PDB file of C-alpha atoms in Angstrom:
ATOM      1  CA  UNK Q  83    -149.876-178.477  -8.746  1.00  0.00           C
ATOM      2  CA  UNK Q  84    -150.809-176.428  -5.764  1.00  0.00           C
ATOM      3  CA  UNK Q  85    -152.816-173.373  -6.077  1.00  0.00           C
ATOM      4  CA  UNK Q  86    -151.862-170.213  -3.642  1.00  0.00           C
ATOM      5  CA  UNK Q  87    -153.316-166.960  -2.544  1.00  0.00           C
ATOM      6  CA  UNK Q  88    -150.441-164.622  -2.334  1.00  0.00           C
TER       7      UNK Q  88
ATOM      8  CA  UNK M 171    -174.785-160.024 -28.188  1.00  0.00           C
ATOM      9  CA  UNK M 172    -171.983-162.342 -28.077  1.00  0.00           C
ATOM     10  CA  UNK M 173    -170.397-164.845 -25.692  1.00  0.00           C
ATOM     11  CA  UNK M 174    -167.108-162.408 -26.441  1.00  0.00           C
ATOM     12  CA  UNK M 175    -168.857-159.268 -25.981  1.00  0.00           C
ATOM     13  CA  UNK M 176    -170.881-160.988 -22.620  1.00  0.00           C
ATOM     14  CA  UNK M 177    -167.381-162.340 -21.222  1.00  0.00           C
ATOM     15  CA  UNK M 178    -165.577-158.805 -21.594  1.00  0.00           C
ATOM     16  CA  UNK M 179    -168.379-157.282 -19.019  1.00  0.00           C
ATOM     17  CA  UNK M 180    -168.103-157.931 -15.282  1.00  0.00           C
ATOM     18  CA  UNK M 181    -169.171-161.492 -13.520  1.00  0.00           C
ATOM     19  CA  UNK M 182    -172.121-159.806 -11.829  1.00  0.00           C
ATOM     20  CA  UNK M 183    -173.356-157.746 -14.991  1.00  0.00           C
ATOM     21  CA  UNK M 184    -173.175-160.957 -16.879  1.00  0.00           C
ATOM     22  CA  UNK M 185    -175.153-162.946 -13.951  1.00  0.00           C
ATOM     23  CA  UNK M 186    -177.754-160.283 -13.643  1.00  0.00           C
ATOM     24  CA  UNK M 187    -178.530-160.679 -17.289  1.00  0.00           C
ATOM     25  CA  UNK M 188    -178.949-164.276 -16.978  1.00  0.00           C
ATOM     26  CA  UNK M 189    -181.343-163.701 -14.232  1.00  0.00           C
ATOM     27  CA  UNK M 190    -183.613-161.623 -15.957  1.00  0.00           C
ATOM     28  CA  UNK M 191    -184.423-163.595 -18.272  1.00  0.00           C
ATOM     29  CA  UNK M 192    -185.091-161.307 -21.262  1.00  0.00           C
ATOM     30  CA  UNK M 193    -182.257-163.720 -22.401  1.00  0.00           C
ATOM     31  CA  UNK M 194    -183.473-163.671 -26.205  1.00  0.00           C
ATOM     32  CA  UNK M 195    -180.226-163.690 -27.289  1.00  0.00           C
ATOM     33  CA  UNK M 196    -178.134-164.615 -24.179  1.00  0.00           C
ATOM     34  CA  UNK M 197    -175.422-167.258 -25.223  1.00  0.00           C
ATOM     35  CA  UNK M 198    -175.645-168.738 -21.410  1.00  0.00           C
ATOM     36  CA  UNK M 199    -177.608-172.223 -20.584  1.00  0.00           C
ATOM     37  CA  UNK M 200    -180.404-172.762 -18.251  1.00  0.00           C
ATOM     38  CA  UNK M 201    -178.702-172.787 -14.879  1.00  0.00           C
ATOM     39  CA  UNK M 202    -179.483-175.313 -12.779  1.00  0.00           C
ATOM     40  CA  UNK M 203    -180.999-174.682  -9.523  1.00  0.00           C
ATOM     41  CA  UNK M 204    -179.555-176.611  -7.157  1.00  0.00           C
ATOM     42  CA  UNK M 205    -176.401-176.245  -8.056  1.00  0.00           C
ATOM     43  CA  UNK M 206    -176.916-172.637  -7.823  1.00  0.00           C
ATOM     44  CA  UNK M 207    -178.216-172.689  -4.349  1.00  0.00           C
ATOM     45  CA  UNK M 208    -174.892-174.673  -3.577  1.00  0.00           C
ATOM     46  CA  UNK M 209    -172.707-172.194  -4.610  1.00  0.00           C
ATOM     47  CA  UNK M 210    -174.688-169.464  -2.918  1.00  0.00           C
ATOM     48  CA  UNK M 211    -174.395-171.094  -0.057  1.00  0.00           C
ATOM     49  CA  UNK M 212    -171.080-171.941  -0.216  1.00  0.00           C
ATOM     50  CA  UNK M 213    -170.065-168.243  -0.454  1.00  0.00           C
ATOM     51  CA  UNK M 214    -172.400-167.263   2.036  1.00  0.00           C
ATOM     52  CA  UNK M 215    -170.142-170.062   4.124  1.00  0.00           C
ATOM     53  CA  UNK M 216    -166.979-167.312   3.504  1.00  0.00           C
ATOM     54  CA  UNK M 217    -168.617-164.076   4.535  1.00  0.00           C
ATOM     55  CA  UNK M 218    -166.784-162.843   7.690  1.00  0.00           C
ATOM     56  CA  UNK M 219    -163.443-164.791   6.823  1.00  0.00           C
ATOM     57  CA  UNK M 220    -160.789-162.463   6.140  1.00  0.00           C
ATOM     58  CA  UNK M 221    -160.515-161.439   2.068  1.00  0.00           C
ATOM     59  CA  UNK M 222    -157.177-163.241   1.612  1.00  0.00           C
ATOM     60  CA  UNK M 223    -158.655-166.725   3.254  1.00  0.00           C
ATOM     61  CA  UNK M 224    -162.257-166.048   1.044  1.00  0.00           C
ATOM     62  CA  UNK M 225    -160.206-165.734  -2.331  1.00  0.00           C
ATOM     63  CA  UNK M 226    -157.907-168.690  -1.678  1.00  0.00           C
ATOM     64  CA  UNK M 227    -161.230-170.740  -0.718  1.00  0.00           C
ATOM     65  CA  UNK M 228    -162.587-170.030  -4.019  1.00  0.00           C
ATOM     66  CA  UNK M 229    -159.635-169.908  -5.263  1.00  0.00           C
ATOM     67  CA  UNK M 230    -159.282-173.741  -4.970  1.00  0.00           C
ATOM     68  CA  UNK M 231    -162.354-174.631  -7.029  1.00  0.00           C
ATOM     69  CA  UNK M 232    -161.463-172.183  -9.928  1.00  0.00           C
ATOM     70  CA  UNK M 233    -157.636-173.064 -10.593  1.00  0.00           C
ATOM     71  CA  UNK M 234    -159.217-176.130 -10.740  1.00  0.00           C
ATOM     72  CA  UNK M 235    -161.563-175.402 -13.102  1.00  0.00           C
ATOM     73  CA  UNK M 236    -159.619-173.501 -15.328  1.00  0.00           C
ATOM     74  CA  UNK M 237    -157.091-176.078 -15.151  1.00  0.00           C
ATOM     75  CA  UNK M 238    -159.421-178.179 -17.112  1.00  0.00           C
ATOM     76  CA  UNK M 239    -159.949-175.997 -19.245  1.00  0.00           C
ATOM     77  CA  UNK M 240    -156.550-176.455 -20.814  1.00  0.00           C
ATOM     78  CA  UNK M 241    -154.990-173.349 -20.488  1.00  0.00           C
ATOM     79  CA  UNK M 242    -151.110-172.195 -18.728  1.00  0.00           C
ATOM     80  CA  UNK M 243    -150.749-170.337 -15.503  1.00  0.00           C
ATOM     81  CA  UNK M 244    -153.991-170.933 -14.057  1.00  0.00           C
ATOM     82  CA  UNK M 245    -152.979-169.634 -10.952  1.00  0.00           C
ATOM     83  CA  UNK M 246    -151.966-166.063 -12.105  1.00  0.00           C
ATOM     84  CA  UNK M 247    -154.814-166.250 -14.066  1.00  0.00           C
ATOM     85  CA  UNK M 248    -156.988-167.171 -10.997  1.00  0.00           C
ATOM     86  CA  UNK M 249    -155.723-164.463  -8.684  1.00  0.00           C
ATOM     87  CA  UNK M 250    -156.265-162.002 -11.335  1.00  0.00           C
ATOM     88  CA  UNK M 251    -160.344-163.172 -11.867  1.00  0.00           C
ATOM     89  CA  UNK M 252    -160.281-162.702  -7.735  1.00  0.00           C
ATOM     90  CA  UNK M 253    -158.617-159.328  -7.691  1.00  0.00           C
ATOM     91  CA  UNK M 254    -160.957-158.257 -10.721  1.00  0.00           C
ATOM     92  CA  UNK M 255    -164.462-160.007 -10.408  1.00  0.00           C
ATOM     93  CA  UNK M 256    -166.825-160.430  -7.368  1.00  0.00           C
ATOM     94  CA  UNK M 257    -166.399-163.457  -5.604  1.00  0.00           C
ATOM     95  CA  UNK M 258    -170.049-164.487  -5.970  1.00  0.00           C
ATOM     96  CA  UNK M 259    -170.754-163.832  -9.760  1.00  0.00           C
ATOM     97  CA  UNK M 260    -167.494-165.516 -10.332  1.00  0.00           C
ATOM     98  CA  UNK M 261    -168.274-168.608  -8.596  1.00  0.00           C
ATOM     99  CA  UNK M 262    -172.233-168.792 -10.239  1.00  0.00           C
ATOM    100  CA  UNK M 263    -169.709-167.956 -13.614  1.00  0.00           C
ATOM    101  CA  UNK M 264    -167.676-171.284 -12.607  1.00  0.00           C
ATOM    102  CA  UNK M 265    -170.069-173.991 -11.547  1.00  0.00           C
ATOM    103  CA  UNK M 266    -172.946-172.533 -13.981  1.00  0.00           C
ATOM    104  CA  UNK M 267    -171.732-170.626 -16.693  1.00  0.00           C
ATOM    105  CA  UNK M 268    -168.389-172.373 -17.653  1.00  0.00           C
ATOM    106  CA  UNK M 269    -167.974-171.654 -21.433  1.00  0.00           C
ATOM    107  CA  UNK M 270    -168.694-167.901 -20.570  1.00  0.00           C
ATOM    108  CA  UNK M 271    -165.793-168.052 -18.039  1.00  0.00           C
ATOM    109  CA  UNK M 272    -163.981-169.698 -20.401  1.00  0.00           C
ATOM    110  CA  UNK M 273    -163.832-167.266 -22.890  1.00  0.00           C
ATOM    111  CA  UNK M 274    -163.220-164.469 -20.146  1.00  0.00           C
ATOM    112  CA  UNK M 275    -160.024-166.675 -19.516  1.00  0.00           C
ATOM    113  CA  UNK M 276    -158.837-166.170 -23.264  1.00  0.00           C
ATOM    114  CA  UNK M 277    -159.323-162.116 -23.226  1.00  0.00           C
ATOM    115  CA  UNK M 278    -156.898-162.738 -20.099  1.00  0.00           C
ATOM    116  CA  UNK M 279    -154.072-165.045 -21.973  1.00  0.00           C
ATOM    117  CA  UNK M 280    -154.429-162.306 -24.929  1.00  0.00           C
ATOM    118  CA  UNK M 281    -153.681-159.671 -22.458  1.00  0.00           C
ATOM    119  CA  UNK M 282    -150.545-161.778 -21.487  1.00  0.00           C
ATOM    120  CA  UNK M 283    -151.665-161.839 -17.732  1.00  0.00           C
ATOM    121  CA  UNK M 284    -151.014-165.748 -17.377  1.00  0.00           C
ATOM    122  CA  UNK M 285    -147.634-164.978 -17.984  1.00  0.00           C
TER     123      UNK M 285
END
């Protein structure tokens, strides 16, 4: 699982 | 004061209490120094990046941390902390003060924000 900033 | 009542105030109102240390009756651990100088200097490392590339830096290391802590939609839950919290205290919070941060994460899943 990748983790993003919008 | 508890680590419920601490957790429910900002990141930098909690840090500044731990850093004067009329702590009789902080629940927070001695922090250790280097790794405190670490994370200072890794956020002194984003100032001057644009906000959006400074919260997905830290980002990184705290949907990673609350990851371990065992708890669903660590991401919504992380952009929330970076929308709410300054990026400093939050970081000292994560690599120094984890149980505190951890029980700012549950007032979050009660408010239904991981969702």
């Amino acid at each position: 699982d990748e983790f993003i900033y919008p | 004061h508890t680590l419920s009542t601490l957790a429910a105030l900002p990141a930098a109102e909690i840090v500044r209490l731990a850093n004067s240390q009329s702590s009789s009756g902080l629940p927070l651990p001695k922090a250790d120094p280097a790794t405190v100088k670490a994370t200072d200097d890794f956020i002194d490392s984003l100032q001057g990046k644009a906000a959006h590339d400074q919260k997905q830096k830290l980002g990184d290391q705290l949907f990673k941390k609350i990851r371990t802590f065992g708890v669903k939609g660590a991401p919504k839950l992380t952009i929330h902390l970076l929308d709410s919290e300054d990026l400093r205290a939050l970081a000292h919070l994560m690599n120094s003060y984890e149980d505190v941060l951890k029980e700012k994460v549950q007032h979050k899943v009660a408010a239904g924000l991981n969702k």
